[PDB]
Amino acid sequence: NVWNGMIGEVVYQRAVMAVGSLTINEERSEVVDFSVPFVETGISVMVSR
Amino acid sequence: NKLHAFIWDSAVLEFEASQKCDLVTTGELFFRSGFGIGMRKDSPWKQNVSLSILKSHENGFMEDLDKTWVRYQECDSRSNAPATLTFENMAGVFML
Amino acid sequence: KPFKYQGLTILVKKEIPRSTLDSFMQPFQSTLWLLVGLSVHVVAVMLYL
C-alpha cells in the first residue's frame, strides 16, 4: 500500500509533475491526476523475424 | 468519381474501405488525436467516466467492440505483390 | 480519456484496371505492326526468289 517511483514521488508531495514515459493506468489515475495523452502507448509483442 | 480526395478520420475511412472495396485510404497518417466523451465543464461524472473508460480499455472490452464493429470486413485487396492476372484482363487474347 | 486513437487521412477511389481488347497490341505501335508484317512477307518472298 505504498507507491514507489513516479507515482510514489508525486503522491507524497515530493514533486509537482511526473514528465516521462508514464503509462496511464486505472490505479495510477485513481491515485494521481493525469493529463491528456500526447502519444499512443499500448502493449505489443516483439519477435525475431 | 465526383471527388478526387476525401479528408477525414482514420477509423471511418478504414471501415469504409473494409466494407466498400472500391475505396482506399492511401495518404500517410497525420494529426494524431482521439475520440473523447465530451461533457459539460463542471459535471461530476468526469472522473468516474474517465475511470470507467480506462478500465474498459485495460480489460478485454474495447477490442471486442473493435472486432464486432470495425475490425470485421468482407474484402480489402491489400497486397504489395504485383496484380494477379484475372479473366477480364487478357480476354482479348481469347477473342483473337 | 480517449476511447479510440486515430488521425486524419485521405480516401481516394481505386481506379480498377479496365483492359481494352487491344492492350496486348499496345507495346508495339500500329505503324510498327504494319512495318514488321510487311517485312515478314518481303523476307519470305526474297528467300525463295
UniProtKB/Swiss-Prot annotation, chain A:
Q: Where does it localize? A: Cell projection, Dendritic spine; Cell membrane; Synapse; Postsynaptic cell membrane
Where L-glutamate is bound, by residue? S21, T23, R28
Q: Where, by tissue, is this protein expressed?
A: Detected in brain cortex, olfactory bulb, hippocampus including the dentate gyrus, striatum, thalamus, superior colliculus, inferior colliculus, midbrain and cerebellum (at protein level). Detected in brain cortex, hypothalamus and cerebellum.
Q: How does it assemble?
A: Heterotetramer. Forms heterotetrameric channels composed of two GluN1/zeta subunits (GRIN1), and two identical GluN2/epsilon subunits (GRIN2A, GRIN2B, GRIN2C or GRIN2D) or GluN3 subunits (GRIN3A or GRIN3B) (in vitro). Can also form heterotetrameric channels that contain at least two GluN1 subunits and at least two different GluN2 subunits (or a combination of one GluN2 and one GluN3 subunits) (in vitro). In vivo, the subunit composition may depend on the expression levels of the different subunits. Found in a complex with GRIN1, GRIN3A and PPP2CB. Found in a complex with GRIN1 and GRIN3B.
Write out the function statement from the record.
Answer: Component of N-methyl-D-aspartate (NMDA) receptors (NMDARs) that function as heterotetrameric, ligand-gated cation channels with high calcium permeability and voltage-dependent block by Mg(2+). NMDARs participate in synaptic plasticity for learning and memory formation by contributing to the slow phase of excitatory postsynaptic current, long-term synaptic potentiation, and learning.
UniProt remark on domains: Contains an N-terminal domain, a ligand-binding domain and a transmembrane domain. Agonist binding to the extracellular ligand-binding domains triggers channel gating.
Q: Which family does it belong to?
A: Belongs to the glutamate-gated ion channel (TC 1.A.10.1) family. NR2A/GRIN2A subfamily.
The entry's protein name is Glutamate receptor ionotropic, NMDA 2A
Recorded name of the encoding gene: Grin2a
Q: Complete protein: which residues are present?
A: 491 to 539 of 1464
From Swiss-Prot, chain B:
PTM entry text = NMDA is probably regulated by C-terminal phosphorylation of an isoform of NR1 by PKC. Its phosphorylated state is influenced by the formation of the NMDAR-PPP2CB complex and the NMDAR channel activity.
Binding positions for glycine per the UniProt entry? D9
At which residues is glycosylation annotated? N48
The record's tissue-specificity note reads: Detected throughout the brain, in brain cortex, cerebellum, thalamus and olfactory bulb.
Tell me where in or outside the cell this protein is found.
Answer: Cell membrane; Postsynaptic cell membrane; Synaptic cell membrane; Postsynaptic density membrane
SS bonds (residue pairs): C21-C75
Domain commentary: A hydrophobic region that gives rise to the prediction of a transmembrane span does not cross the membrane, but is part of a discontinuously helical region that dips into the membrane and is probably part of the pore and of the selectivity filter. The extracellular N-terminal domain (ATD) is a site of allosteric regulation to modulate overall receptor function.
What does the protein in this record do?
Answer: Component of N-methyl-D-aspartate (NMDA) receptors (NMDARs) that function as heterotetrameric, ligand-gated cation channels with high calcium permeability and voltage-dependent block by Mg(2+). NMDARs participate in synaptic plasticity for learning and memory formation by contributing to the long-term potentiation (LTP). Channel activation requires binding of the neurotransmitter L-glutamate to the GluN2 subunit, glycine or D-serine binding to the GluN1 subunit, plus membrane depolarization to eliminate channel inhibition by Mg(2+).
Q: Which family does it belong to?
A: Belongs to the glutamate-gated ion channel (TC 1.A.10.1) family. NR1/GRIN1 subfamily.
Q: What is this protein called?
A: Glutamate receptor ionotropic, NMDA 1
Curated annotation (Swiss-Prot), chain C:
Q: In which tissues is it expressed?
A: Detected throughout the brain, in brain cortex, cerebellum, thalamus and olfactory bulb.
Transmembrane residues, as ranges?
Answer: 30-49
Free-text description of this protein's post-translational modifications in UniProt: NMDA is probably regulated by C-terminal phosphorylation of an isoform of NR1 by PKC. Its phosphorylated state is influenced by the formation of the NMDAR-PPP2CB complex and the NMDAR channel activity.
Subcellular location(s): the record lists:
Cell membrane; Postsynaptic cell membrane; Synaptic cell membrane; Postsynaptic density membrane
Question: Which family does the entry's similarity section mention?
Answer: Belongs to the glutamate-gated ion channel (TC 1.A.10.1) family. NR1/GRIN1 subfamily.
Q: What is known of its domains?
A: A hydrophobic region that gives rise to the prediction of a transmembrane span does not cross the membrane, but is part of a discontinuously helical region that dips into the membrane and is probably part of the pore and of the selectivity filter.
The record describes the protein's role as:
Component of N-methyl-D-aspartate (NMDA) receptors (NMDARs) that function as heterotetrameric, ligand-gated cation channels with high calcium permeability and voltage-dependent block by Mg(2+). NMDARs participate in synaptic plasticity for learning and memory formation by contributing to the long-term potentiation (LTP). Channel activation requires binding of the neurotransmitter L-glutamate to the GluN2 subunit, glycine or D-serine binding to the GluN1 subunit, plus membrane depolarization to eliminate channel inhibition by Mg(2+).
Q: What is this protein called?
A: Glutamate receptor ionotropic, NMDA 1
Question: What species is this protein from?
Answer: Rattus norvegicus
**From-to range in the entire protein, with total length:** 531 to 579 of 938
